[PDB]
Amino acid sequence: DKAAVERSKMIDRNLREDGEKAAREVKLLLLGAVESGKSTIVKQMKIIHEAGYSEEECKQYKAVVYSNTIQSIIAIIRAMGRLKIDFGDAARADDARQLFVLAGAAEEGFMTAELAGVIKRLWKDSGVQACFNRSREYQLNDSAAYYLNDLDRIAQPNYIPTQQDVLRTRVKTTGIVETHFTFKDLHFKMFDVGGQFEGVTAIIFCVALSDYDLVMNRMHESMKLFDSICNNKWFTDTSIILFLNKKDLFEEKIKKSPLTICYPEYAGSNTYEEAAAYIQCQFEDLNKRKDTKEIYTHFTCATDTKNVQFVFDAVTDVIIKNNLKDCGLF
Numbered sequence: 570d571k572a573a574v575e576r577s578k579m580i581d582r583n584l585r586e587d588g589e590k591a592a593r594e595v596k597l598l599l600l601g602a603v604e605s606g607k608s609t610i611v612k613q614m615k616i617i618h619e620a621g622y623s624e625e626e627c628k629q630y631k632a633v634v635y636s637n638t639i640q641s642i643i644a645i646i647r648a649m650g651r652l653k654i655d656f657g658d659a660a661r662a663d664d665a666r667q668l669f670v671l672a673g674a675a676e677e678g679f680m681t682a683e684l685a686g687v688i689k690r691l692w693k694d695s696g697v698q699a700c701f702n703r704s705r706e707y708q709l710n711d712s713a714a715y716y717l718n719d720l721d722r723i724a725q726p727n728y729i730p731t732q733q734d735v736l737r738t739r740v741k742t743t744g745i746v747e748t749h750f751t752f753k754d755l756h757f758k759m760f761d762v763g764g765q766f767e768g769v770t771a772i773i774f775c776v777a778l779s780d781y782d783l784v785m786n787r788m789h790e791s792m793k794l795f796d797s798i799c800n801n802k803w804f805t806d807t808s809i810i811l812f813l814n815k816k817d818l819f820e821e822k823i824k825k826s827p828l829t830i831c832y833p834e835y836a837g838s839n840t841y842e843e844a845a846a847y848i849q850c851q852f853e854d855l856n857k858r859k860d861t862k863e864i865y866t867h868f869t870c871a872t873d874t875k876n877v878q879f880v881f882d883a884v885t886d887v888i889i890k891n892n893l894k895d896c897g898l899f
């Protein structure tokens with residue numbers, strides 16, 4: 570392989586007594602709007618380049634999974650009111666109340682066969698499904714459907730959250746979060762600064778593809794942010810990687826939502842292929858120094874480990890082929 574040969578022409582470890590034991594380092598900054606997938610990418614590095622999440626670890630996320638599910642159903646139910654949606658069967662109107670009774674009596678996330686029932690019956694309702702399917706009209710968790718459909722398993726008294734349950738969680742992050750992991754004998758120091766560094770090695774910029782029909786426009790606020798980044802002088806010598814994330818939700822959304830909601834001038838077919846290609850182009854086009862700087866775009870499903878591993882392996886080769894010389898030995 571070419572990246573292997575590239576690595577091989579370095580002579581800097583020879584300048585260190587025990588240089589063959591030295592640590593080559595890669596400072597990687599993770600950027601993107603809130604909920605673009607940054608924290609999930611961080612968890613996937615744990616999962617892929619470390620042990621991941623142990624049973625004991627996953628167990629710590631149970632109330633978060635419960636918290637997420639609860640918030641998800643309450644958001645849909647509360648939406649029905651503002652959107653004026655009727656329950657498919659008006660018996661549900663009594664469970665809706667029960668949801669607020671059970672939720673309104675706890676400080677923390679929980680699950681009971683009782684609550685499980687109320688939520689199952691509500692989720693199964695046509696009117697609720699009608700509200701759910703109109704989610705671009707209100708604030709709703711991305712994993713809402715994921716959890717809601719697996720209620721039975723999640724509800725089980727002796728339920729243990731899977732790694733995926735852990736990756737699907739929405740957790741309030743505050744501050745920079747730094748993760749260290751080794752991949753290909755490269756010691757990465759990964760920094761997630763939150764959607765809210767003059768010489769970083771590479772930058773992975775996350776974009777939630779599914780935010781397109783969310784109705785300044787969401788997609789455009791991310792475009793505005795990516796413009797600032799890839800064009801910033803500090804990042805001139807930094808590998809700019811673009812993760813057009815949530816391709817799974819976008820694949821299912823573009824089916825019934827037109828890209829024109831986001832890009833009014835879009836005239837291509839409303840297909841996953843053309844619509845996604847358009848978005849990439851829209852972003853890579855913000856690059857001023859095209860002659861000089863290249864943007865590395867990858868369509869990702871951050872909650873899909875295989876995809877993230879595949880994509881990260883690719884991302885990593887680009888760093889070796891393009892930035893190793895700027896990478897220090899410690």
Ligand SMILES: Nc1nc2c(ncn2[C@@H]2O[C@H](COP(=O)(O)OP(=O)(O)O)[C@@H](O)[C@H]2O)c(=O)[nH]1
Pocket residue numbers: 601602603604605606607608609610710711712736737738739740742764775814815816817818869870871872873
């Ligand atoms: N379906 C799907 N959900 C995703 C994807 N990436 C992240 N998520 C979910 O989006 C939510 C917010 O992502 P998170 O990593 O917390 O975003 P951050 O605010 O950028 O850190 C969580 O529920 C994640 O599990 C993706 O590609 N597909």
